[PDB]
Design a protein around this ligand. Structure first.
Ligand SMILES: [Pt+2]
Ligand SMILES: [Pt+2]
Length: 124
């Protein structure tokens, strides 16, 4: 078991480093966070900000989610993130990823009581 919140933190949070450590960051991180378990998760974003900072996005700018739900929120400040994108030659189980660092606003969907991030919707 794992809550939706816990799962967001496993899939999307990496406060430990300020930036995308290396060209190899996604290869290691996607595997270690169990995102390469039953398939190669095609794309995935890691956020290098404190949990509190990311949690607080749930009270920031309310915007439409990509699926049309209304519970998405855009960060008023840009945040340090790393985008992981599966390569063209990547073949499960040896999942291969391109690691791209950026500073962008994040959009998360929040749910629950407490109202916390449960999905990563977009970066802009
Ligand atoms: Pt902006
Ligand atoms: Pt999701």
């Amino acid at each position: 078991k794992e809550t939706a919140a816990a799962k967001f933190e496993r899939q999307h949070m990496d406060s430990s480093t300020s930036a995308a450590s290396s060209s190899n960051y996604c290869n290691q991180m996607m595997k270690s966070r169990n995102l390469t378990k039953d398939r190669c998760k095609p794309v995935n974003t890691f956020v290098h900000e404190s949990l509190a900072d990311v949690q607080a996005v749930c009270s920031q700018k309310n915007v439409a989610c990509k699926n049309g739900q209304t519970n998405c929120y855009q960060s008023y400040s840009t945040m340090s993130i790393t985008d992981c994108r599966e390569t063209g030659s990547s073949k499960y189980p040896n999942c291969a990823y391109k690691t791209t660092q950026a500073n962008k606003h994040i959009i998360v969907a929040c749910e629950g009581n407490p109202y916390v991030p449960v999905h990563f919707d977009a970066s802009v």
